[model samples]
Target: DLPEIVASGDPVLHEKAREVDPGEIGSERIQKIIDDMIKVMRLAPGVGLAAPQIGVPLRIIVLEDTKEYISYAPKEEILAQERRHFDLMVMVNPVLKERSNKKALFFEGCLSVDGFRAAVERYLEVVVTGYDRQGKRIEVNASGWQARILQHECDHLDGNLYVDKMVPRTFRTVDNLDLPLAEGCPKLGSH
Candidate 1:
């Protein structure tokens, strides 16, 4: 059965996703969830989608590999470009192993709360440690949108929202909801 995508204000979205049992890997249920997540994320026009966003409490989030950095691209644009080489990355039981203390404000939005966004400060870069379906170790040195998305997804795993880390309304603006890593904004990326 196709999993349902949770709407805004769902309690599970704020709840951290539980570590998936090793036994559950490659099971019918997990496969179905991943399929549904891909469907919902494509439908939701999101570059990344988590199980909790779909009312599941598992530490699994499906990310479109092509969604590297979203600075000027709109969510709708991202969805339209989904057909191009999309490497589906299923991050199960993901954890942030390290992050720079340098915090920078970046505009962020959620599929749960479409059309509205706020400026959120997060680590400029992060090291993500996790496993794939085959139980192979995966380490991601994320920067730019990759880093930002990692932090966002990790927060979902830890039961937090981008709104929780948002700067005050006075500082939050919508000028760059689509364009995130523009000049004038302090950011971390490939040297």
Candidate 2:
């Protein structure tokens, strides 16, 4: 059975995942982890999660579309009417080689560390090189929320966390965080 998401400080969090061979991109083990991650993220109301978050020190992270803010919009609005659907993304052996000089700041949190949100600085755009579910190589230029999520997950792969990179005054630990998170934040993006 898939396990519960690992909390911060688990030895797994600090361990670096080995680069994935192309063959495992969509292997049964990888698929199960992705599916379990999606289910786990939904259960935690999180948008993104990494393998380490589930006690697997693998270079894989799961990103899901955010459905927050829609609830506040008036019903009947086209945007508001769009039904909530799970659009989980599986990123394997991700490599972050370049980042846009442009910067963005957003309040962020981590599932492993619960109930905390802090302003963190991140690149607005980034280029990701990795393999898709089919194990074919792919390069994606992503920005905004997608970019943020990618960076966040990449940080995990390197044994880093949003809290460590928080921008000073922007820093707020779980006890002092007072902002409403964007519905919920997945491991990858800002709230």
Candidate 3:
């Protein structure tokens, strides 16, 4: 059985995750954790999930933003955001380096945060260096919505939540989101 995601009030969510020992990255235990994390992330229908969000204190994250999943959004909003499909990704001990001065605004939500969404400004591009499921080094330069997902998941590893960086006044309940998606880009946050 998969573990339930830890909620926002849990102290673990606020704790910085420790890096996995190099030797342990390929161990059965870590592999199983990665598998379970992926299962739970997709099952939660979240774009990304970090280890801390799942009650673990290890530097790891899993994400997917496939077209099939983004189909949940209004078609007009998808086109405006220039959202693209991202195959399933698993990053362990990931490190992020901001790559651009440009920033874009979008709403963001979290699995650990059950009901609220808020507007957030994120860098337009980032270079992420991390290890894959087999512990091999991988580097990706992500932009647009994918960049936002990288920043969001990495923040969780650093003991931060979307709510921490959110525009305070823009926060709203899921059912009360007043932003209009058809205007241009979708205003609803994706977890």
Candidate 4:
């Protein structure tokens, strides 16, 4: 079973998460934490989750994006986001390596800051270095939507939320995200 998702105003979500030692990952505590992260993430139907979001200040993140989730958005948004399906991924103590200069701005929501969405600028391609669920070294060279999710989860380890990077006027309740922007707010579509 998973702990309750920590809300944004909580101290755990605002503080930097600790890096899990390689050997410590096999411990029963960390093992269960990782498992429930995926479980809760899927239940939230979230594209990603970080350890701190569950009130554990550890540098672990899990993500998965299926075709079904992508289809929930408009096709125009999909093409602009360069979104595609990705299987489950778990990273421990991940060191994000962002190499691409290309960038995109798209609407993003977080499990920690539930029921809200905002436009955040993100890289189109990135490489992240970390260990797998088994503590084996792993590297991910990701592009498009996958890269965006990676950046979002990794930011949590640094005590950063999408709100920190969100376009100031673009933050809106999920229901209002599709409605016309307030006067002077940027356009709502991906940029």
| Reference-based TM-score of each model | 0.75, 0.79, 0.91, 0.93
Full-model lDDT for every candidate? 0.68, 0.72, 0.86, 0.87
lDDT of 2 at 163: 81
User: What tens digits encode model 1's per-residue C-alpha lDDT throughout 139-170?
Assistant: 77665555667777778877788777766552
Clashing pairs in 4: none
Best first by lDDT, ranked? 4, 3, 2, 1
Per-residue CA lDDT of model 3 for 1-191, tens digit only, reads 99999989999899889999877889999999999999999898888999988789999999889888887899877765657888889999999989978777777899898888887878878999989999888998898888989999999998999888976577778887765444333343332
RMSD of each: 5.7, 6.4, 3.8, 1.7
Residue 155 alpha-carbon offset, candidate 4, angstroms: 0.7
Flag regions of model 3 displaced more than 4 Å.
Answer: 180-191
> Better model by TM-score, 3 or 4?
4
lDDT of 1 at 26: 70
The candidate, 1 or 4, that scores higher on TM-score is: 4
| Candidate 2 per-residue C-alpha lDDT over 36-88 given as tens digits, one digit per residue, 9 for 90 to 100 | 88788778777678888888788887776655733553454423223242456
RMSD of 1: 5.7
Q: lDDT tens digits, residues 10-67, model 4?
A: 9988889999999988889888999999889988788999999998899999999999
Top model by TM-score, which number? 4
Candidate 1 vs candidate 2: which has greater TM-score?
A: 2
